[PDB]
Design a protein around this ligand. Structure first.
Ligand code: CED
Length: 256
């Protein structure tokens, strides 16, 4: 198998699920295997935020301090004195994987347990948010806290971005943020021809966990929704982006 081969080449475990929303054809490989979801959860978290707020309500300004900043704060670290609006925090979380921005958003929607409950409400019984940054990224093999599966992430991303868990105006915000992600150029985007629009959210965590979930719009036709998840056996393992890009090429061929 080509996915087997990639696991062999990169000494890693792959979880793949892809759904062609036009034909309902799928590609699956360990689709129900749990991984730490890492930063991919940011995309569903903005999903819930959008559901719970009007678009105008996203203009509420959040005051924060150094105490709210954590390990990776590319946008939030610049605006402690002014604060940021919810809209600006959603942009920072989604486009730069700003961890403080995700923590602030999570607090505004009622914390990890509240996020879990809202995910259950949209039909996701798999994804298990429990912790804030930075703790959520430390997941040992066999533990379920802060994990999901490729199938569940695809199903939930679809629900928010493409189906009816959000009104069109809010779907458009979400899709536009993910389309202009700056963190993903070496992953799913790198397995898809230039010029196909891709909306994605990346993650990275311990045990060399390296994830990307995306919606891909092919030259006309309906979009594909894809999760590529990976992990490795040693806690301090490095990852390689190229695994995700090569996995994406295998998916596109299998759907073509
Ligand atoms: C590189 C990276 C990303 C990303 O590419 O999406 N997002 C942030 C977050 C979510 O996955 N990861 C962490 O905070 C944990 C880390 C792993 C490696 C360095 S920090 S910060 C680390």
């Amino acid at each position: 198998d080509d996915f087997a081969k990639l696991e062999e080449q990169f000494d890693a475990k792959l979880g793949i699920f892809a759904l062609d929303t036009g034909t309902n054809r799928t590609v699956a490989y360990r689709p129900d295997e749990r991984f730490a979801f890492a930063s991919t959860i940011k995309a569903l978290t903005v999903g819930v935020l959008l559901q719970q707020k009007s678009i105008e309500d996203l203009n509420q300004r959040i005051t924060y301090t150094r105490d709210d900043l954590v390990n990776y704060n590319p946008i939030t670290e610049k605006h402690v004195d002014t604060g940021m609006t919810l809209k600006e925090l959603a942009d920072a979380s989604l486009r730069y994987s700003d961890n403080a921005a995700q923590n602030l958003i999570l607090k505004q929607i009622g914390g990890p347990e509240s996020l879990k409950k809202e995910l259950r409400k949209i039909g996701d019984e798999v994804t298990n948010p429990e912790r804030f940054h930075p703790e959520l990224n430390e997941v040992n093999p066999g533990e379920t806290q802060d994990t999901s599966t490729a199938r569940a992430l695809v199903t939930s991303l679809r629900a928010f971005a493409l189906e009816d868990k959000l009104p069109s105006e809010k779907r458009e915000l979400l899709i536009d943020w993910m389309k202009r992600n700056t963190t993903g150029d070496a992953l799913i985007r790198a397995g898809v021809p230039d010029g196909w629009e891709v909306a994605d959210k990346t993650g990275a965590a311990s045990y060399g966990t390296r994830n990307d979930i995306a919606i891909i719009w092919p030259p006309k036709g309906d979009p594909v929704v894809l999760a590529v998840l990976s992990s490795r056996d040693k806690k301090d393992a490095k990852y390689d982006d190229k695994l995700i890009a090569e996995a994406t090429k295998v998916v596109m061929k299998a759907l073509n």
